[PDB]
From a paper:
Guidance receptors of the Uncoordinated-5 family (Unc5A–D) have emerged as key players in navigating cells and axons (Hong et al., 1999; Leung-Hagesteijn et al., 1992), where they trigger cell-cell repulsion in response to extracellular ligands such as fibronectin leucine-rich repeat transmembrane proteins (FLRT1-3) (Seiradake et al., 2014; Yamagishi et al., 2011) and netrins (Hong et al., 1999). [name] receptors consist of two extracellular immunoglobulin domains (Ig1–2), two extracellular thrombospondin-like domains (TSP1–2), a single transmembrane helix, and a C-terminal intracellular supramodule, which contains a ZO-1/[name] (ZU5), an [name]/PIDD/Ankyrin (UPA), and a death domain (DD). In agreement with previous findings (Verschueren et al., 2020), we show that [name] receptors directly and functionally interact with the morphogen receptor [name] ([name]). All glypicans share a similar architecture: a structured N-terminal extracellular core domain, followed by a C-terminal linker region of ∼80 amino acids (Kim et al., 2011).
We solved crystal structures of [name] residues 32–483 (hGPC3core) and murine [name] residues 31–482 (mGPC3core). Human and murine [name] sequences are 94% identical and the two structures are similar (Cα root-mean-square deviation, RMSDCα = 0.54 Å for 353 aligned atoms). Crystal structures of the core domain of human GPC1 (Awad et al., 2015; Svensson et al., 2012) and the fly ortholog Dally-like-protein (DLP) (Kim et al., 2011; McGough et al., 2020) revealed an α-helical architecture comprising an N-terminal lobe (N lobe) with 6 conserved disulfide bonds, a central M lobe, and a C-terminal lobe (C lobe) that contains a furin-like convertase cleavage site (RXXR) (de Cat et al., 2003). Compared to previously solved structures of fly DLP and human GPC1, [name] has a more curved shape. We modeled glycans on two predicted N-glycosylation sites (N124 and N241 in hGPC3, N123 and N240 in mGPC3) into evident electron density. (B) Electron density map calculated from murine GPC3core crystals is shown in blue, centered on N123 and N240 of a symmetry-related molecule∗ (left) and N240 (right).
Numbering used by the authors: 59 to 185, 191 to 307, 314 to 348, 382 to 433, 455 to 476
Write the structure that this text describes.
C-alpha cells in the first residue's frame, strides 16, 4: 500500500521496512557477483605483477654487481668512487622501472659527470675543489663523444618499455578492482530488488526471475559498463603488441662504459692542456598474454555472468517478471574514469611498439 519498489499487484507480505532490507541485500548481492566474476582475473595480474617486479629487480641488481666487478678488475684507480656513481645510477634505474619520476638522460649524464673528474685526477693527471669545473668540462668539451647519447638511447628504449609494462599490469589491476565497486543508478537498485526479491513479497517460495527479464534489467544498468569493452579489448591487444630486452642492455653497460673510458683516454694530451687552462623472462610474459587473452570478453560477458550465476528461469516459463508470475515472458562518472585511464594507457602502449 505504501511500497516504493515492489509493485503491489495483489496483497503483499512485506512492509516498507522489509523493502529496505531487500534493497540493501540487492546491493550486496550485486557486489558479490561482480567480485566473484573479477576475482580470477584480478589474481592473475596480481601474481604476474609481483613476480615480474622482483624479476626485474634481480636483473638490475645483477647488472649493478657486474659493472662494479669490471670496475674493480679494469679500473681500480677509479674505485671506490666508481661504486658510488654506479650504485646511484642503478638505483635510479630501478626507481624509474617502478614508475617514479626519473629522467633517463639525467641518469646517464650524472653518471658521466661523476666519472670524468676521477678519470682525470687518477688516470690522466695524477696529482677536489676544482671538481665542479671538471664536471662542466665533461659536457662542454664532449670528452666522451657520442657514448653518453649512445647509452642514453640504449637504456631509455628498454627502460621505457619495461616501465610501461609494469604500469600496464598495475592499471589492469586497478580497473578490474574498480568493476566490483561500481555503484549503479537508483532505478537499477529497484529493478534488481524486483528481479531477485519482490517475488517473496507476493508470497512465492521457489519462483525464479525470467532469463529475458534478467537480460533487459542487466542491459539496463550495465549499459555504461558494457561500453568499456572496446577499450578493455584494445588494452589486451596493445599489451600483446608490446610483449611481442632490458636484460641484455643492462648487462652490457660495463662494456660500453669501459670503451668510453678508453675513448676519453685516447685524446688525453690535448685534453689535459685544454682543461688545465680552462680550470626465461620472455616465456613468462608470453604465458601471461595467452592467459590474458582468455579474458578479452570480460566486459561483454559481464551481464551474461550476473544472469547466469543468479537463480533465473532460463526457459522464460513460469517465472517472475518483476511484478507477477507469468506463463511466458513478454520482453557514468566512474565508468568514464575507467575509460580515460584505459585510453591513456592504450595510447602509451601503441607508441612503444
Ligand atoms: C651481488 O649483489 C648483492 C646484492 O646487491 C651483494 O650483496 C653482493 O655483494 C654482490 N656480489 C658481487 C660479487 O658484486
Ligand atoms: C581494490 O579497491 C579497494 C577499494 O577501492 C582498495 O581498498 C583496495 O586496495 C584495492 N585493491 C587493489 C589490489 O588495488
Amino acid at each position: 500500500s505504501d511500497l516504493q519498489v515492489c509493485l503491489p499487484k495483489g496483497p503483499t507480505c512485506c512492509s516498507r521496512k522489509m523493502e529496505e532490507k531487500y534493497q540493501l541485500t540487492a546491493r550486496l548481492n550485486m557486489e558479490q557477483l561482480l567480485q566473484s566474476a573479477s576475482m580470477e582475473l584480478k589474481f592473475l595480474i596480481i601474481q604476474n605483477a609481483a613476480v615480474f617486479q622482483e624479476a626485474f629487480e634481480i636483473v638490475v641488481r645483477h647488472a649493478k654487481n657486474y659493472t662494479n666487478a669490471m670496475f674493480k678488475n679494469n679500473y681500480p684507480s677509479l674505485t671506490p668512487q666508481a661504486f658510488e656513481f654506479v650504485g646511484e645510477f642503478f638505483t635510479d634505474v630501478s626507481l624509474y622501472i617502478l614508475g617514479s619520476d626519473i629522467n633517463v638522460d639525467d641518469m646517464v649524464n650524472e653518471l658521466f659527470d661523476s666519472l670524468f673528474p676521477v678519470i682525470y685526477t687518477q688516470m690522466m693527471n695524477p696529482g677536489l675543489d676544482i671538481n665542479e669545473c671538471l664536471r662542466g668540462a665533461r659536457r662542454d668539451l664532449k670528452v666522451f663523444g657520442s657514448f653518453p647519447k649512445l647509452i642514453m638511447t640504449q637504456v631509455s628504449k628498454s627502460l621505457q618499455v619495461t616501465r610501461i609494462f609494469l604500469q600496464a599490469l598495475n592499471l589492469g589491476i586497478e580497473v578490474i578492482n574498480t568493476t566490483d565497486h561500481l555503484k549503479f543508478s537508483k532505478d537499477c537498485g529497484r529493478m534488481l530488488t524486483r528481479m531477485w526479491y519482490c517475488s517473496y513479497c507476493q508470497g512465492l517460495m521457489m519462483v525464479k526471475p525470467c532469463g529475458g527479464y534478467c537480460n533487459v534489467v542487466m542491459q539496463g544498468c550495465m549499459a555504461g559498463v558494457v561500453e568499456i569493452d572496446k577499450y578493455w579489448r584494445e588494452y589486451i591487444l596493445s599489451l600483446e603488441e608490446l610483449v611481442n630486452d632490458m636484460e641484455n642492455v643492462l648487462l652490457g653497460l660495463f662494456s660500453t662504459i669501459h670503451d668510453s673510458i678508453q675513448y676519453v683516454q685516447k685524446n688525453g694530451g690535448k685534453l689535459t692542456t685544454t682543461i688545465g687552462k680552462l680550470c626465461t623472462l620472455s616465456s613468462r610474459r608470453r604465458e601471461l598474454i595467452q592467459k590474458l587473452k582468455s579474458f578479452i570478453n570480460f566486459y561483454s560477458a559481464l551481464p551474461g555472468y550476473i544472469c547466469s550465476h543468479s537463480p533465473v528461469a532460463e526457459n522464460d516459463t513460469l517465472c517472475w517478471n518483476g511484478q507477477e508470475l507469468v506463463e511466458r515472458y513478454s520482453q557514468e562518472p566512474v565508468v568514464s574514469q575507467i575509460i580515460d585511464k584505459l585510453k591513456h594507457i592504450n595510447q602509451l602502449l601503441r607508441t612503444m611498439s
